[PDB]
Structures are given as structure tokens and as C-alpha cells.
Amino acid sequence: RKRRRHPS
């Protein structure tokens, strides 16, 4: 698990 942004 890398923390990452998530698109809308």
C-alpha cells in the first residue's frame, strides 16, 4: 500500500 490521490 502506497498512499495515493484518487480521481473524480
Place this chain on the structure above:
Amino acid sequence: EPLESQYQVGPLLGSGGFGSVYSGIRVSDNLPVAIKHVEKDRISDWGELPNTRVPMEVVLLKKVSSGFSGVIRLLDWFERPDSFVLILERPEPVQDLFDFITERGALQEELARSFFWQVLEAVRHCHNCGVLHRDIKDENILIDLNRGELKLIDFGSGALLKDTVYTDFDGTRVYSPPEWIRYHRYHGRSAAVWSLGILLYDMVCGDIPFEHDEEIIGGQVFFRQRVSSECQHLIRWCLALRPSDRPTFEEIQNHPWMQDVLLPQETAEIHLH
């Protein structure tokens, strides 16, 4: 009144499904602004002002931009052949809560309490003005590091608040509630409280709890960091699988974990300066 002569256009900040956002200064008075461009071709939802077919985003921002709050205010906007351009406030210095959490890791509960409280007040502000954000997450929250003030951004996936069912959703899937994953239906407030549960977990644990659909609808919450029993309780309540089991905004702000919040100024002095 051209866009090019009233504002001094700087360089990019970000881009995505929201649009493209540049640094800018109001020449009139050297106010820091954000200049956001949206192509008409890429806009899904449209609305009308009190009179003019504009993007829903402009409709929602006008409704929440009345007086002061924890929402980035729309200062001006412009139509163009193929796009609209929104002029928004830009705090300096600023960091988004997503980069802030990446940099610092899991926040201390005292800090998480102040941040979460200010987000709750900004969302209540939105609901009081008939606006549903539908994309509450760390990336859509700016921190004014000097004032210790959080500001909500990007209403591009929002809607007028209603008490009836929503069957469309354009926000972030990993903050969407189980009832959206399973049935493509949700009510506004109860979906909002779910996303706020994700956000609170994100703050105290250093990342979101769920990545896959199976995890969202499982509503099994594992704490990967030391979190007080009271905070675990509020998070599990916000993340109740049944919408009607989630707390109201009032029940969140009356929750024992939420008491004795720091003021924004305290928050900056103790945790940001």
C-alpha cells in the same frame, strides 16, 4: 473587462477532472487569486443563475460564497467561446490536506479534531445554502498555514441539496458509500457523513481505510495506528453500512471525541507555525 487585463496570470498549480488552475494576482489590489479554466465540452452538469446557462459549479459556488466561511469563495467568473474561467480566493501560504498528511503522517487527535471540526462547519455551511459537495476528501481541503483555517474546494461534482434519492455520482469512489457501490443510490447527508468518516480515518491513520469495492461494502474498519476508543467510535458510526444508522451532523459535533476543539489561531500556533 477582459480576464487578461484585470488579473495577472501566473503558472499552473494543478489539473484533473476539475479543470486547470493557475496562480494569479488581482492587479486592482495585488490579491492572490486562483484562476480555474473548464472546457464547455468537458462539463457534465449545467444550471441557471437567478436569470444564463452556466456550469453547476458556478451555481453552487455563488450559493456558498455569501459572507465568510470554510469554503474557497468565487470572486468573479467569465464565459469564453470554448470555456469558463472562475476567479477564486487563494490563501498564501497554503497546503492541501492530502500533501499535509503525506508529509506529516497520521495527525495527532488534537489536530485531527480541529481540522475535522472546521470541515464539519464548512459542510454544514454548504447544506444550509442548499449545496451538496459530493467529493469531500483531503485533496479538496486547503490549509491556510498562518490562520489555521481549512477551506473546501472543487464543487465540480456537487449538486443542489435535495431530500430525495441521488442516482448519479461523479466524486471519488473510495470516499463513496456502500449504498452507491451496491445499488447506485444514496441520500445527500448520509453519503456526506460516510465520506467524512473516510476523512477522519485518513487524518488519524495517515491513509484512507478502503481501496476496493469489497472493502467499502464489507464495513470492516481496521485501525492501522493507535486511535482513542472515542475516535474509533465516531469513525465506526460515520461508517455504518446502513445509511439511517449514520450520525447526523448534530450527533457528530455533540460526540464526546469532538469536545474542547482548538480555535483556528491556537491550531496554527501549536501545530502549523
